[PDB]
JSON list of C-alpha atoms and ligand atoms in Angstrom, two decimals:
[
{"chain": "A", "resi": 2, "resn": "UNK", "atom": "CA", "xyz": [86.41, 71.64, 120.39]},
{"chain": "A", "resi": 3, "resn": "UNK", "atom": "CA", "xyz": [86.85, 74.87, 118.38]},
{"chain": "A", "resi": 4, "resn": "UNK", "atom": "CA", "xyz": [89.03, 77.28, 117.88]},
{"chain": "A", "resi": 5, "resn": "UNK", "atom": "CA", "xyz": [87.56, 79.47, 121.02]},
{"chain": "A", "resi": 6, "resn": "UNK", "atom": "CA", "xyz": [86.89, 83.26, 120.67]},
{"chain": "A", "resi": 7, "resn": "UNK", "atom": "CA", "xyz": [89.62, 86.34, 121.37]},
{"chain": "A", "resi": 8, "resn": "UNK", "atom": "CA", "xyz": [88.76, 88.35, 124.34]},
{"chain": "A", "resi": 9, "resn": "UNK", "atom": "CA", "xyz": [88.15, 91.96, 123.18]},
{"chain": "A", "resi": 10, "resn": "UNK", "atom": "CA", "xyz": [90.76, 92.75, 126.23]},
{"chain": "A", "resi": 11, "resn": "UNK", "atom": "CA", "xyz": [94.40, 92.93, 125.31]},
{"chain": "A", "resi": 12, "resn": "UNK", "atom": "CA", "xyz": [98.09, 93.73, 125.51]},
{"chain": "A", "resi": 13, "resn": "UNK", "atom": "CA", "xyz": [100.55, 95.47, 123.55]},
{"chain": "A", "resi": 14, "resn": "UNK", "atom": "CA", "xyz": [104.38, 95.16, 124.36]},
{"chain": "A", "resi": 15, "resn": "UNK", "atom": "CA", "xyz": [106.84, 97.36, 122.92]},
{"chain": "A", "resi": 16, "resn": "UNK", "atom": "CA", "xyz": [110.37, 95.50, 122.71]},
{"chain": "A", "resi": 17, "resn": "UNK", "atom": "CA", "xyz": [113.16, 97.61, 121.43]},
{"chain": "A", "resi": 18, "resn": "UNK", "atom": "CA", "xyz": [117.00, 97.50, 122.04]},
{"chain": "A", "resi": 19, "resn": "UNK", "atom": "CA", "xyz": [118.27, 99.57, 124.48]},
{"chain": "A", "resi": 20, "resn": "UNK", "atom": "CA", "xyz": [121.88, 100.19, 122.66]},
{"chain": "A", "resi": 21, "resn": "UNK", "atom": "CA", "xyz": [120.51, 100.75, 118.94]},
{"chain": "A", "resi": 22, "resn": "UNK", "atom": "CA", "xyz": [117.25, 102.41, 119.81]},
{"chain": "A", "resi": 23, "resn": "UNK", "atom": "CA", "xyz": [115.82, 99.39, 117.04]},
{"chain": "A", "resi": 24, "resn": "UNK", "atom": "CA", "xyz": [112.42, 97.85, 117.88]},
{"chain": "A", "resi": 25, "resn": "UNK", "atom": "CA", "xyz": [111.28, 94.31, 116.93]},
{"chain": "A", "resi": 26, "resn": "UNK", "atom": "CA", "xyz": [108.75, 93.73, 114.27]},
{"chain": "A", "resi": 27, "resn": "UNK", "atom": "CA", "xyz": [107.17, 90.69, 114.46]},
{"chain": "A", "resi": 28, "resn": "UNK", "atom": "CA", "xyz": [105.15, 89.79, 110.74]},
{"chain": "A", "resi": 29, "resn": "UNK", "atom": "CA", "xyz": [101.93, 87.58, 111.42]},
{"chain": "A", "resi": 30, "resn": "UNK", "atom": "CA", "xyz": [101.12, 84.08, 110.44]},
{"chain": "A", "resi": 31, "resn": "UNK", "atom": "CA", "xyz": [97.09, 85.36, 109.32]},
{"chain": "A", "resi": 32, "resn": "UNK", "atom": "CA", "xyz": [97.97, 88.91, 108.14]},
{"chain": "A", "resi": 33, "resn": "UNK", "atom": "CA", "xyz": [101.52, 88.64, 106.54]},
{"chain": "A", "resi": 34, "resn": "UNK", "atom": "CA", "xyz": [101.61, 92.68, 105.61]},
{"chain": "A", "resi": 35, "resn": "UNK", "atom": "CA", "xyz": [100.73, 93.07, 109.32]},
{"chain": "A", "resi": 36, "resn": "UNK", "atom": "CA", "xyz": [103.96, 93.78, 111.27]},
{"chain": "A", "resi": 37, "resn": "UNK", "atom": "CA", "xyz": [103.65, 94.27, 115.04]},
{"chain": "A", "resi": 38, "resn": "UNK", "atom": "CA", "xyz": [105.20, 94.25, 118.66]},
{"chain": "A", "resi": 39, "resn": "UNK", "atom": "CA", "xyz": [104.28, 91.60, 120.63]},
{"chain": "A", "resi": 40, "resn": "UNK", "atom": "CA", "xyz": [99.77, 91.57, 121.78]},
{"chain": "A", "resi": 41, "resn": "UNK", "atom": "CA", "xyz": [97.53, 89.09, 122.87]},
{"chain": "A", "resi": 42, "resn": "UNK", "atom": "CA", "xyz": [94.54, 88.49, 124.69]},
{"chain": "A", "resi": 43, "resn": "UNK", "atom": "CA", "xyz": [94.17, 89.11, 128.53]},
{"chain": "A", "resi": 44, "resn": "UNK", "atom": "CA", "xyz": [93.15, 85.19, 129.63]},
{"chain": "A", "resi": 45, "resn": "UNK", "atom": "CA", "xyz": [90.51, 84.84, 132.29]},
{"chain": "A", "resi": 46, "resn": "UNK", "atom": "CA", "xyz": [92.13, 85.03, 135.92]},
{"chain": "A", "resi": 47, "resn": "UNK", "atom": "CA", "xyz": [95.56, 86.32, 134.90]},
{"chain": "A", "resi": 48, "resn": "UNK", "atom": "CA", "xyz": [95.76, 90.31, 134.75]},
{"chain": "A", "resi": 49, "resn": "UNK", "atom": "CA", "xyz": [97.40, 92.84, 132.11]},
{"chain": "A", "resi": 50, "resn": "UNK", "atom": "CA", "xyz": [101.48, 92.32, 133.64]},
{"chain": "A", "resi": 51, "resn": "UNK", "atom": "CA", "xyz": [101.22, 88.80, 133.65]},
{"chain": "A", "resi": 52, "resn": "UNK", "atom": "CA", "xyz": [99.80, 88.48, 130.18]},
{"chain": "A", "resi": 53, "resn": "UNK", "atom": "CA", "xyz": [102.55, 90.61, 128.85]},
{"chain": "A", "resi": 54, "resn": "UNK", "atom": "CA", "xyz": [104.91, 88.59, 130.39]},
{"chain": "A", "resi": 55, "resn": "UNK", "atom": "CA", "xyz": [103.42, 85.38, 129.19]},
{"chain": "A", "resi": 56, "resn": "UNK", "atom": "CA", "xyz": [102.55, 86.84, 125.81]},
{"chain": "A", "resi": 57, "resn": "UNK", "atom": "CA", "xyz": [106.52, 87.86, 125.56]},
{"chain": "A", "resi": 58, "resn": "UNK", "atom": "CA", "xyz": [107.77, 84.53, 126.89]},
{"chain": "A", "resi": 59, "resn": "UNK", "atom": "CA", "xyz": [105.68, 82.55, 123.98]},
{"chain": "A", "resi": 60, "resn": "UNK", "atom": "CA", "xyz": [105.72, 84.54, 121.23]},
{"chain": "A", "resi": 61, "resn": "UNK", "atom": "CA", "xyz": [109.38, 85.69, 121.43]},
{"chain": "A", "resi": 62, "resn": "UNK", "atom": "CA", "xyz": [110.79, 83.39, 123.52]},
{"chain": "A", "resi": 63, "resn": "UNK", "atom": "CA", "xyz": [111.96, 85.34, 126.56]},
{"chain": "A", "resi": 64, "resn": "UNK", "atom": "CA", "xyz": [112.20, 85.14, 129.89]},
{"chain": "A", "resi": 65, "resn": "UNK", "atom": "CA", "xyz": [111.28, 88.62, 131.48]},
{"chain": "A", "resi": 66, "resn": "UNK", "atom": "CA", "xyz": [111.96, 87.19, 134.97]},
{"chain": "A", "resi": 67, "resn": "UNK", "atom": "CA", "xyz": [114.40, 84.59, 133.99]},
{"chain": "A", "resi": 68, "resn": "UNK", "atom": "CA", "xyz": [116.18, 87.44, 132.51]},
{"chain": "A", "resi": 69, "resn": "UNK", "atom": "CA", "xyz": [115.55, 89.98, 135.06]},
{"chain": "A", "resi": 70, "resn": "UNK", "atom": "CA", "xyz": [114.28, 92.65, 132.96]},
{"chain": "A", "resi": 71, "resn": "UNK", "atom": "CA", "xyz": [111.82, 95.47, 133.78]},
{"chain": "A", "resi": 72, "resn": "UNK", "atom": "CA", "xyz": [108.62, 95.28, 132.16]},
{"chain": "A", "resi": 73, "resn": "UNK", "atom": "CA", "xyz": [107.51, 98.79, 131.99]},
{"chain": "A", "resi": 74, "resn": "UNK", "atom": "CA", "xyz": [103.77, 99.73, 132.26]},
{"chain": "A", "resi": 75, "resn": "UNK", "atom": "CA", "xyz": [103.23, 102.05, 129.62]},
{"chain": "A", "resi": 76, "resn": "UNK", "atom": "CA", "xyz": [100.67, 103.55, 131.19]},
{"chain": "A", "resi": 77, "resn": "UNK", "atom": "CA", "xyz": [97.99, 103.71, 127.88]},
{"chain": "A", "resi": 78, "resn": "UNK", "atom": "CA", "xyz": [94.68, 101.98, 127.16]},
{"chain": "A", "resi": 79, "resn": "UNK", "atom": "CA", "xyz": [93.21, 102.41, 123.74]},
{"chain": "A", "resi": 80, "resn": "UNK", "atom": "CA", "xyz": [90.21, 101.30, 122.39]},
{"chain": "A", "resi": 81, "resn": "UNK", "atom": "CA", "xyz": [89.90, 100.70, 118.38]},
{"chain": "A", "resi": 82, "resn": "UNK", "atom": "CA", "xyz": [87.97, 99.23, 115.33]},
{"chain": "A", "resi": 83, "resn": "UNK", "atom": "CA", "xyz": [89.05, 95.45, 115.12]},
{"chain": "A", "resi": 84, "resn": "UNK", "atom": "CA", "xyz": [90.48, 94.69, 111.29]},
{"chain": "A", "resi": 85, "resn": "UNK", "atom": "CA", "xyz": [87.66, 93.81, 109.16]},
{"chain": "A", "resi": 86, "resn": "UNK", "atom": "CA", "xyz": [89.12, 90.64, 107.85]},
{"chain": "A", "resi": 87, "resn": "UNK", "atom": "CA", "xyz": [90.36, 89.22, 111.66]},
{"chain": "A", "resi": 88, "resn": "UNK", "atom": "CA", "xyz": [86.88, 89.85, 113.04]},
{"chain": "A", "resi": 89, "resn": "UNK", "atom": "CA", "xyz": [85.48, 86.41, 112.86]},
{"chain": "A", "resi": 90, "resn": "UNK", "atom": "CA", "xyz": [88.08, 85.71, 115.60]},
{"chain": "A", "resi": 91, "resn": "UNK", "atom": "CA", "xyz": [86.06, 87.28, 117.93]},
{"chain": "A", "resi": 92, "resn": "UNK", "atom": "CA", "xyz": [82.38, 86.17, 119.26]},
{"chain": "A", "resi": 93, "resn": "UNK", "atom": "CA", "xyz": [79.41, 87.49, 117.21]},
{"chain": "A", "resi": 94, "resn": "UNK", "atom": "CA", "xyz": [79.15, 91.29, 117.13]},
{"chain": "A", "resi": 95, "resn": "UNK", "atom": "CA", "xyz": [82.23, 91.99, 118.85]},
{"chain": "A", "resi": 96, "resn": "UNK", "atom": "CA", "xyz": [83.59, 94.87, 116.47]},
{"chain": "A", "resi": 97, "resn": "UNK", "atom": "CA", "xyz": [85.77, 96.74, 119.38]},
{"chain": "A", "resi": 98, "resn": "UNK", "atom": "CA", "xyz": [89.07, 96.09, 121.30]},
{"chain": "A", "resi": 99, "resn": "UNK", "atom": "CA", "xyz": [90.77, 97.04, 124.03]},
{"chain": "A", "resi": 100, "resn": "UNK", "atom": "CA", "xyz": [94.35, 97.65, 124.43]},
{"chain": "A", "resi": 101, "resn": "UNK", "atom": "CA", "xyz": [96.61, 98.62, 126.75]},
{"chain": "A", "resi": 102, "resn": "UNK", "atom": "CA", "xyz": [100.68, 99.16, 126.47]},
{"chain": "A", "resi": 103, "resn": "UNK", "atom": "CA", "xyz": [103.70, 97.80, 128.03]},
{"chain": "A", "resi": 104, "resn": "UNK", "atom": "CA", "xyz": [107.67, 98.70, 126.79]},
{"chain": "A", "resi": 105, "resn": "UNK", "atom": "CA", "xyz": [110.28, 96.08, 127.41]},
{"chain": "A", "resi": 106, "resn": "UNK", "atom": "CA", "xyz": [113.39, 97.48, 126.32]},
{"chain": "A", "resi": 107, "resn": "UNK", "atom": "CA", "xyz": [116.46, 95.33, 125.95]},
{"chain": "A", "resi": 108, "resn": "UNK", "atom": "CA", "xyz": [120.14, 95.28, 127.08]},
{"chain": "A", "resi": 109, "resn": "UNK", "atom": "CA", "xyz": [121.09, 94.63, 123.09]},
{"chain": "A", "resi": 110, "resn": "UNK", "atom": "CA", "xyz": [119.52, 93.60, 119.53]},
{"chain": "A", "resi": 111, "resn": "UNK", "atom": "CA", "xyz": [119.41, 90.03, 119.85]},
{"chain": "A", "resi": 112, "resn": "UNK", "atom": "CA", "xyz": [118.61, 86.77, 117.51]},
{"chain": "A", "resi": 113, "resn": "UNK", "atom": "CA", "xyz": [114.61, 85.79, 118.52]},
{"chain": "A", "resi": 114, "resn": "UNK", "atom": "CA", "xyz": [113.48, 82.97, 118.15]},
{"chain": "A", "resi": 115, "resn": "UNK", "atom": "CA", "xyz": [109.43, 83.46, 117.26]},
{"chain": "A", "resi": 116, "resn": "UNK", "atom": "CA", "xyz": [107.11, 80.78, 117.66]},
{"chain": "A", "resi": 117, "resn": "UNK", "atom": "CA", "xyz": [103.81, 81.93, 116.13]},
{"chain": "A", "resi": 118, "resn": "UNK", "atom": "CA", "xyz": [105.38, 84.81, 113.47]},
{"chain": "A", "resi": 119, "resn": "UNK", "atom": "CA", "xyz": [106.82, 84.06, 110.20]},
{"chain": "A", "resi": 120, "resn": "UNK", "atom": "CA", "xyz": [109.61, 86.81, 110.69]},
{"chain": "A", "resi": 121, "resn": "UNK", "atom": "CA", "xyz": [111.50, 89.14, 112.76]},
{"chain": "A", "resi": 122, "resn": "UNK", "atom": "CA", "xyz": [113.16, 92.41, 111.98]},
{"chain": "A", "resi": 123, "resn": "UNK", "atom": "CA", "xyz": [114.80, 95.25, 114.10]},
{"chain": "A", "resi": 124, "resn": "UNK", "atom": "CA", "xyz": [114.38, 98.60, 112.45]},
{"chain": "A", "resi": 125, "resn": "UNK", "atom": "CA", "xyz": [114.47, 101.80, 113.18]},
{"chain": "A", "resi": 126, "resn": "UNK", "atom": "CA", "xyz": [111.70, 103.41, 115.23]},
{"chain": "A", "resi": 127, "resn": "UNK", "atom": "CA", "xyz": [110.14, 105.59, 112.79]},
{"chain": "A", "resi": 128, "resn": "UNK", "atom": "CA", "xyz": [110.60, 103.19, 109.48]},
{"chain": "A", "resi": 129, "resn": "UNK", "atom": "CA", "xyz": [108.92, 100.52, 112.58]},
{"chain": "A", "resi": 130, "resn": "UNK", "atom": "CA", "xyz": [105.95, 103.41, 112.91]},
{"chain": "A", "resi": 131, "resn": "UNK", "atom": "CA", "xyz": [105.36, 103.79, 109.19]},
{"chain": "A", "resi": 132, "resn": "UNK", "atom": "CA", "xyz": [105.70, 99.91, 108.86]},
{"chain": "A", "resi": 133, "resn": "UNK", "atom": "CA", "xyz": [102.75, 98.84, 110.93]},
{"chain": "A", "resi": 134, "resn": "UNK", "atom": "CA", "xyz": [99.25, 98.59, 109.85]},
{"chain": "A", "resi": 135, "resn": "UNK", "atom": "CA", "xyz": [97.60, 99.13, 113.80]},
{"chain": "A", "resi": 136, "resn": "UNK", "atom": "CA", "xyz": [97.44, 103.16, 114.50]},
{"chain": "A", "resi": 137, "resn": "UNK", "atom": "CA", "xyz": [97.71, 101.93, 118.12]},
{"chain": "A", "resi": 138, "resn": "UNK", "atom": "CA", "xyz": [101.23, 100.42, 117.41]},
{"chain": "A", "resi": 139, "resn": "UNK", "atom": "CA", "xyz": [102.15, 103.06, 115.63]},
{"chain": "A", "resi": 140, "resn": "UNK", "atom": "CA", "xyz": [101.37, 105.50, 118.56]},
{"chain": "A", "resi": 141, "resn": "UNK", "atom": "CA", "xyz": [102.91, 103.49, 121.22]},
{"chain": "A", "resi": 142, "resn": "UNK", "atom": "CA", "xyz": [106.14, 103.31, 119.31]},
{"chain": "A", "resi": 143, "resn": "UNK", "atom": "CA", "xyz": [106.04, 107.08, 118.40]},
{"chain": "A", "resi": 144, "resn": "UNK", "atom": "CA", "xyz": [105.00, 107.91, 122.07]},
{"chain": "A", "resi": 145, "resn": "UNK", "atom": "CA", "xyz": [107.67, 105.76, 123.98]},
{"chain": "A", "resi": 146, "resn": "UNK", "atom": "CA", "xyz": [110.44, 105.21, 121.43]},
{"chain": "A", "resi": 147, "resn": "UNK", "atom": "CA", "xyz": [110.91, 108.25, 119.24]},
{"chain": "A", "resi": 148, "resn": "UNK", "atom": "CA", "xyz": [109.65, 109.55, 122.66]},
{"chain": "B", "resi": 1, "resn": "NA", "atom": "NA1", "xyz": [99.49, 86.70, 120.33]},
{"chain": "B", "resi": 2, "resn": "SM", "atom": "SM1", "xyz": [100.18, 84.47, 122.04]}
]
């Protein structure tokens, strides 16, 4: 029909390299100065885990389970001001979304292939920090990265 509305309910997963300490900034298709970990909605009947999972295996093409890897539950929920200009992606008077975090670190830096991004790039933790536009990002990676 349309292009259907965002739920207000989401996930944030922080993928970094376990052997250069690097994390992976992903540079969006509708923002292209916003550069971010891996989020997405929380679909209807699916919980938090399994939408990071399924968020990581289509945006950045990898198989947490397939891979066995340890998808780590951050253990934050934040709540924040959606970005003025990606509002109308939500339903009428939404203005607020909820987060919560996840880190995926792995085994070594790899080549990604991204499916919805325009770019990848693996930088250091704090240039990743300063790099991102989302405060929430930013935390998570200072947080459970810098640590
Ligand atoms: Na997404
Ligand atoms: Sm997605």
């Amino acid at each position: 029909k349309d292009k259907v509305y965002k739920r207000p309910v989401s996930i944030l997963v922080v993928i970094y390299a376990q052997d250069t300490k690097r994390v992976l900034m992903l540079q969006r298709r509708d923002d292209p100065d916003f550069w971010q970990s891996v989020t997405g909605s929380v679909e209807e009947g699916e919980t938090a885990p399994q939408a990071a999972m399924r968020e990581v295996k289509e945006e950045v093409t990898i198989d947490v389970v397939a891979e066995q890897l340890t998808l780590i539950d951050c253990q934050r929920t934040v709540e924040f001001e959606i970005f003025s200009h990606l509002r109308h992606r939500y339903a009428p008077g939404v203005t607020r979304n909820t987060e919560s975090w996840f880190c995926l670190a792995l085994p070594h830096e790899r080549q990604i292939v991204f499916t919805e991004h325009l770019a990848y790039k693996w930088l250091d933790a704090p240039a990743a920090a300063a790099l991102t536009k989302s405060w929430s990002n930013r935390q998570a990676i200072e947080q459970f990265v810098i640590n």
